[model samples]
Target: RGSHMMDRREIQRRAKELEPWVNGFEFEGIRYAEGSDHQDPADRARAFYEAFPGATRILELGALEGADTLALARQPGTSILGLEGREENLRRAEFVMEVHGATNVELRIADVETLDFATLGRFDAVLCAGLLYHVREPWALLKDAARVSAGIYLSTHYWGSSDGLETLDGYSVKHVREEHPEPQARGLSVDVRWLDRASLFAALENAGFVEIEVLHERTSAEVCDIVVVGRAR
Candidate 1:
């Protein structure tokens, strides 16, 4: 069965409107659509909600083109706010949201680094993927997220070899290198930091999250990535 709302050609035309899509997706049985090959958004959403059953109002940081936002919106009884820094990306995300009829999601153009999380009120959970490393101040951003949400799902990369502790705002954070090649695939800026495993853990701990669990772990020669779920004590 295919969507009667739009034919394949119409779908292709609409998809073409959003050129330079980073992810390849599908719609109405149409293949090779614009979107990323990252994990299926539905699958990721299900796993995230399963991990945090009580999450209803969610905040998503670094929603590149709303792939994750669509996934988050599919969860029943949940409403999601996806924050993307780039206007062009936000527009594409909004288009996807409309095309998918994901009514529960709201996409906003805002920089995670500059937005005041406290001013926006709190959420049951915050979903931050692929955005932590892009900021110059990772610990500060974590602290903001901690202040506004009881639970958080953070997926990001950390340096494999770097180690040590650095004090920030009375908290001790582990050390990792402060430079990396631009991850152009995700439209990330060159300015970023990679936390070592220890530092990554410490940063979350200091952010007022007493319970932290590593859901997934990946490692390459130069970097180690992990998805960590955190809960405030």
Candidate 2:
């Protein structure tokens, strides 16, 4: 079902509008990033590579400004395919890759929810990091990601009641609740239904992937991410 709430154009426009506030953003003399902000992007890249070593083709969905994309591109014996729907981000990603002399990264302006991965050919591994949970139908996005992978790695803002309630900051909360929101198809909410380990594994299996396991996790202040690794079964 197509979302009347926001289309791809609207999504990209909103992304551009909010991106300036996010770029090179700093907090207390340190560069702040969404998830793994304090850690080195390169080290994260290395960990990503270690998830599926011997990979020749690497796909990164939602490669914002090529932060991890540039790092992954720099690694020996891997080619990085970064899909970003935002044009502004793709340009910045290009600049980052050029500046870092990363020759193996290719930035594509695209959406993961509906991308035709079969035509794009196959990859030894795919990375769908930091993309889900922001969109409503995270599972649909996962299905698409799974479509293109021989090896798969993904991370999302998953939590449950055990994690505690986040106080809604505004009136939008009532409206959001009143809408009788379904997961829709390709978007998420600030107030997410956090996935515990069992639920996380269930989602992977539902998407037809096997050997699913959580590879990394941590919580800082308020939220946690479940990094999953698996293969097409």
Candidate 3:
């Protein structure tokens, strides 16, 4: 009934091996033992894949435990490179990829804060979900994304008030700061910058993404987050 039909007790034992997992994912009726951020990553990736079809190569930033990676691999003839910053998470991701026979997935430990697009090579598409707000210098990453891919699917949080621009490393960036405790806990950089809505749009434009499509958005009194698809001109 499952992968190799392993007994339920054995599966539980294997699941218990990885403690403190943020979420869980199922593969072929065999559930991988982990935890997640309430939302199913596969569902999120489904939206992106539908928006951009026939993406053979994909670069996924923050591939926590490979839930989204596995989902991306579901597409026919697709190859995925999932960059995860934490070794523990990377290990777990590898385990799942192996368990599910995800032959097209290549998981690597990389800090996106210091990632080089040239070294990453090029991809048909990029998935930058749950990553932008975690960095102090997101603009740099977006520029690199443009250099490395023709299409981008991003989901991130934005500041809602006091729209303005600030300087960082001699580059003018519009953003706002938010409080984040234990940044490394999520394998994110210590500094967090929530870009304002207008600033986010402008930054993508500055990064060479001319066709940007907002798939979903939600706003609160203090912050807003959106899912957007970007295509190069």
Candidate 4:
């Protein structure tokens, strides 16, 4: 009655019931969330391994709908443990992965901010994308990730300017409130922090990620975004 019995028609039936998907996937001729930021898994996994080529056991933080998890799982000889905070999001992810026949990944519902990575065992690499800004203590999450993995692929938003900023644990941060327009797709904590560029890198280094390589950076009126491969080595 679960993944074993889910055919294309049954999948479509469930996918409709679980509407307002944040990510898109086309499974068994059924389109789920057809146009919403459906990232290419092939290209995504390529970049991930390219950044941390030696990783086989991967820990993916904030796997919103398991859209990226599918691509991560497709990598040969790799296993992924993807943690999503929301139950509804995890259900959507589970359905998509089931329909797509994903066997190498495990998606679970866990609050990213409060997770202790050490208990989860060591990972060759960690994937942290689109999640740091949502955390109340962004630095603490990175510190925890360093304990379990040598490297992490982090793509997150940062504060471009230091206006109206405050310090949290001696780090520069911009305090902001998240309006959870959709509880399924938004941050669990309404109040969050965004680190400035300097503090962001500093936090990573302080967390034992001494080697940092910037993959991309963007600045705009709406936001500032940065992508980097942070390595403890």
What is residue 162's positional error in candidate 4, in angstroms? 1.8
| Per-residue lDDT of model 3, residues 17-61, tens digit only | 765576664555766554544446778877878877878899999
Q: What is the TM-score of candidate 3?
A: 0.84
Superposed model 4: Cα runs more than 4 Å off: 1-5, 32-39, 180-183, 220-222
* lDDT value, candidate 3, whole model: 0.77
Which ranges of candidate 1 are over 4 A from the true structure?
1-10, 32-38, 163-190, 219-221
* Candidate 3 vs candidate 4, TM-score winner: 4
lDDT of 1 by residue, 67-157 (tens): 8888788766999989888777787788788777788998888877778887777798898887787776788789989988888888888
* Model 4 weakest lDDT span, ten residues long: 30-39
Report lDDT (CA) for all predictions: 0.76, 0.62, 0.77, 0.83
Name the Cα RMSD for model 3: 3.2
Winner by lDDT: 4
Tell me, by TM-score, which candidate is best: 4
Model 2, CA-based lDDT:
0.62
How many backbone overlaps does candidate 4 show? 0
Q: Could you tally the backbone clashes for each prediction?
A: 4, 8, 5, 0
Model 4 per-residue lDDT at 199: 90
Model 4 residue 225 CA deviation (Å) reads 0.8
Candidate 2 per-residue lDDT, tens place, 1-233, comes to: 24423344444444444345334533224343232222367887777778787888988887877788877877678888898866766776775565456888888988655567777777878787766655444556667767777678787766533343332221011112212122212232433333444455666777778777677777554456677787776
Error of 4 at 213 (Å): 0.4
Query: Worst ten-residue run, lDDT, model 3?
Result: 176-185
Specify the poorest-scoring 10-residue window by lDDT in model 1.
Answer: 178-187
